[PDB]
């Protein structure tokens, strides 16, 4: 539910970087927002990402499942991260 998504955000936030925006789009996050996010946290790449995810969790209160998160990660080739995200979700 809630802490599960937390643990996943932490692995993702500290691991994506570069193609964060690619990820944003996959999570069906309007660029109207992605724009803003670049704006608000020009400083840390880690914050921007997280934020990205947050918007995603607020877009679907009930369907915000790690499933989809891993699904988002793998369509963008961020396999190694969806993998880790999956092994931390299995251990919990």
């Amino acid at each position: 539910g809630e802490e599960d998504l937390c643990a996943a955000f932490n692995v993702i936030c500290d691991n994506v970087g570069k193609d964060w925006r690619r990820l944003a789009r996959q999570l069906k996050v309007s660029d109207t927002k992605i724009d803003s996010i670049e704006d608000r946290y020009p400083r840390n790449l880690t914050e921007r990402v997280r934020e990205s995810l947050r918007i995603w969790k607020n877009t679907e209160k009930e369907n915000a499942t790690v499933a989809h998160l891993v699904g988002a990660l793998r369509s963008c080739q961020m396999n190694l991260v969806a993998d880790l995200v999956q092994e931390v979700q299995q251990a919990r």
Partner: protein, 86 residues
Amino acid sequence: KYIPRIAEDMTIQEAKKFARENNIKEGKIDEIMHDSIQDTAEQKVQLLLCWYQSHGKSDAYQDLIKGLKKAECRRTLDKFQDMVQK
């Protein structure tokens, strides 16, 4: 974790042909090709690492070696063979 230590001995061009020649999307490598036409600094591991995110599940090292040989190298997989060996 070897993806880094491996690029070390590799070259920006061999590795080049490597990844692109391993189902890592040719379009992605085009960005990384122009992203630094003259930079083998980090440029090496960057290409290598993107492929890593490509598979990474089971027996990935095999694909790195076998594929490295099938990508008209038969030389890069040799120095990496010494690293995992080590």
